[PDB]
Amino acid sequence: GNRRIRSVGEMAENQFRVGLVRVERAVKERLSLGDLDTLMPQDMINAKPI
Amino acid sequence: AAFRSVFPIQSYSGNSELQYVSYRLGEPVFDVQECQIRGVTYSAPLRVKL
Amino acid sequence: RGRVGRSHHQAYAWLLTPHPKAMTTDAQKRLEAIASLEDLGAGFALATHD
Incomplete structure (x- = not known):
């Protein structure tokens, strides 16, 4: 009753989360960086960390 | 989540x-048996509308 | 910075910085150098730290 099953879904979701943590830091610095008018939701995010 | x-x-x-708005999984580029033949991932691309 | 002057009136220099997390590391040290060093004959010290 104290030990818990973490099956395929929960680790995959957690690793997706920690991958998205680097993405949100990157878009933090990029989105806080200015000249934002010509910016589209493609170049802030990067699929390399995910 | x-x-x-x-x-x-x-x-x-x-x-x-x-x-965030929604996500949607793209169609996998090959079939499973093809991905075993070529030696690459049976992966589904993720596309998110932001 | 030496562009203005050559008169008998106090001139002023106004230096726009972004958010401190938004500015880059070299730009940080650039601004701390020119903030810390502001008096006469500074540019040789400025070149010295360059």
Whole structure:
């Protein structure tokens, strides 16, 4: 009753989360960086960390 | 739960915010048996509308 | 910075910085150098730190 099953879904979701943590830091610095008018939701995010 | 737990994102200048709408899995580029033959991943591409 | 002057009136220099997390590391040290060093004959010390 104290030990818990973490099956395929929960680790995959957690690793997706920690991958998205680097993405949100990157878009933090990029989105806080200015000249934002010509910016589209493609170049802030990067699929390399995910 | 992952996208909602991370997004939406203020900028550091409280001027811009990047939020989430929905995701959708793209069609996998090959079949499973083909991905075993070629030696690459049976992977589904992820496309998110932001 | 030496552009203005050559008169009998106090001139002023106004230096726009972004959010401190938004500015880059070299730009940080650039601005701390020119903030810390502001008096006469500075540019040789400025070149010295360059």
